[PDB]
C-alpha cells in the first residue's frame, strides 16, 4: 500500500526477501536500480499499480515468485538487468507478462497464464531463456521477438489469440519440442528472423519449411 | 508442553480468534497491507480490507493431561480404537487400559502425544509433527484481490 | 417461493455472511450504536464494535422442491417427526406419507413450507362456511 | 406473556366463546349489521342473523409455564420429537431434557415459545408469529348471504 | 511415494537393520559417544558401546498401492478403525468406504498415506477463500 515501490534496492545494495510480500503498491512491487540485487525466493508481489518486479540495471533472483494483477509487465528487466526465476508463476498482468528490454531474463520452467498482452517478449535486443515454460490465455502472442532470441527447448503454448510464436527483425526462437496448440499459423517469421523446431508435430508455418526467403529462414527438421 | 502455531486467518476468523483469546489493544496487519486495530477488546479502526486478506497470528496450544483436548484418538490395551472430542485425557473413565493417544489435526494426521503411560516430551512432539504428514501437497492458488486503493 | 428470515449475528458472523452473500455497499448497525460499512465488498469503516454486539440482518432463501435445503423437518400422517440435512424435498424416499415439512432456521424457529402434497404457496387454506344462497326475504319490522 | 387474538366467529362459535369466557352483559355486532345481546350471561335479543354472519371477537391467550397449553411440540436433548395436548409445560416428567418447545396453531405452523431453558419474550414471540407462516394464501370467497330485510 | 522415518535402535537392532538393508561403508554414532563402523558391509570397529545405547537411523520406505505394507491402519467413513498386517492397500476388500489409511511405524507413530480415494501425494488439500475478483476500485484517501 505504499505510494512508491514496495521494496527497492538502489546503487549497489543487497536486499533479501525470502518469503515476503510486496503487494498493492502504487509503483513496481520490487525494483533493483543500478547494480543492486534483491533476492526473492518465494515472494508474493501481486496487485500493484505497476510492474510486479523491475530490474533497472540491477539483478533480481527468484525461484517461485508469484505475480498477479499488476498494472504492467509482471517481470521486467532493462538497461542490463537480469531477472532469474526458475519457477516464476506470473498471471493476469494488464500488459506483457514478462518482457526483456535490452537485457536478459531466465525463466527456465515458469508457468504464466492469462496475460493481457504477449505471453513473453524480448524487445530491442536481449535474450529470454526457457526450458518447459507454459503459456496459456495470452493476449496477442505466446512468444514474441524484436531482434532478440528466445530459447524454449519445450513449451505448452495454448489459448493464444493471434499467433503462438512470432519472430520479427531478426532473433531466433529455438522452440524445438513445443507442444503448441492453436488454430492460427503456429510458427511465424517476418523481416529476416529465424525459427528452429521439430518436425514430429506438423505445425502450420508462415514460410516454406526449410528454405531462405526475404523473410527469415525456418528449419522444421 | 506448549506448541506455537502460526496461521493465516481471514477477517472473520481473526476477529473470532481475537475475541476468544482476549486482546486488550493491538494492531493486526494483513497480507495486502490492510490493518485492523483492537482497542479495549473492541474493533475501532479498520483500513480497506478486501475479502481473502490474510492476517498472521500465532497461538499457543498446550497439551497436558488435565486440560481438554479438542480431538484425540485412544487405543485400548485390548485393541479397540475410539475417538474423543473436547475432553481431557484424565477424563477417561479407565485410563489404566489406554495404551496410546494421538492428537488429531483436522488433516486426518495423527501425532502421538501419549505412549507408555506418559506424555510425549516437546522435542519428540516436534519430530512427530514434522513426521506425521510429510508428503502433504497443498493446492497452489494465487489471486491478488486488490489494487492500490487511492487515485495516486 | 421466497422465505424471509431475520437473524442476529456478531461481527465475525456478519462479515462471513456478507462476504458469502455478496454485498456491494451498505452499512450495518448494531444494538450499542456500533456500525460497520461495506463499500465495494470491502470493510472500509468500523466504529467501536465490542463483543456480544448483535447486528440484525434479514436473509432471503429461495425454496423449491428441486433445490436442496440446509435443514428441514418432516412430519408424516401417523405422527412421526424426522429431520433431514442437505436434501431436496423431492429427494425424500417417502413423500407418499409426508404430510408437513418445516424449515429449521438455525434459531430453532420453524417455517412451514410444505403442506399436504404441495408447497405452502400453492396450498389455498379453505375457510369454513355453511352453504346457502342469499336470504332475499322480506322480514317484518319492529319500529 | 399475553397475546391478543382477533377472530371472526359464526353465531354458534360466538355463543360458545361467550359462555366459556363469561360475559355479563355485552352486544356483539356482526359483519352484516345483525347483533346479539348478552344480558346476565344469557342471550336475550338477536336481530335477523343469517348463516355465515361473522362477529369480531378478541381473546387473550397467555403463554406461561404453569398454565396448560392446548397443543405443543417438544424436542428432547437426545433428538426425539413428541407432541403434547392440553398440559402445562411444567407438567412434563423430565423438563430437564427438553431443549425446545413450539406452540402449534392448527395451521401446522410452529412458533417457538421455549428455548435455552427460558420462555420466549413477547416481542420475539410476535416476530416468530409473523415469521412462522409467511406465504399463507387463504382462499378468496365472498357471498353476501343477505339483503336489507325490511320492505323499505 | 517415499516415507522417511527416524528411529532409535540398540546395537543388535542396528546391526540387524544395517545387514538387512545393505550398507557398504559408513559410521553410526550413539548418544554416549560410542560408535560402530561398517566397511564393505563388515563391522570393522566398535568403541565402548554399552547397553541401552540408542543409535538414531533414518529409514526410507517406498509406499505404493501394489506393494504390501508391514502394518497399517484404516478408517472408514462411519468411524470404525481397523488394523492390517502384510497386505497391500489395493488388496483390501472394502476400499469403497475406506476414507483414511495411516502407516503404523513400530514406534506407535502414525503417518498418513491414503486420503479420500488417493495416495497422500496425489491429494491436493484445497484451502478456503471467498470467491471474488480484484477490487480494482478507487477509494477516497484520509490524509
Author numbering:
A (entry chain D): 389 to 609
B (entry chain L), D (entry chain L): 1 to 152
C (entry chain K), E (entry chain K): 1 to 143
Task: Quote the study's own text.
Staphylococcal picoviruses are a group of strictly lytic, short-tailed bacteriophages with compact genomes that are attractive candidates for therapeutic use. Here, we report the structure of the complete virion of S. epidermidis–infecting phage Andhra, determined using high-resolution cryo–electron microscopy, allowing atomic modeling of 11 capsid and tail proteins. The head has icosahedral symmetry, with the tail attached to a portal structure located at 1 of the 12 fivefold vertices.
The PP monomer consists of three domains: the wing (51 to 160 and 258 to 334), the stem (6 to 50, 161 to 186, and 234 to 257), and the clip (residues 187 to 233). The wing domain resides inside the capsid where it interacts with the portal-proximal core protein (gp20) and the DNA, while the clip domain connects with the tail stem protein (gp16). A 128-residue insertion between amino acids 122 and 250 forms a twisted β-hairpin, creating a 150-Å-long tubular β barrel with an inner diameter of ≈32 Å that acts as a conduit for the DNA. The Andhra RBP consists of an N-terminal 36- to 38-residue loop followed by a 34- to 38-residue α-helical coiled-coil stem domain, connected to a 534-residue C-terminal β helix domain. The true start for gp6 is thus most likely at nucleotide 1887 (TTG). gp6 forms six asymmetric dimers that bridge the RBP trimers and the tail stem protein (gp16).
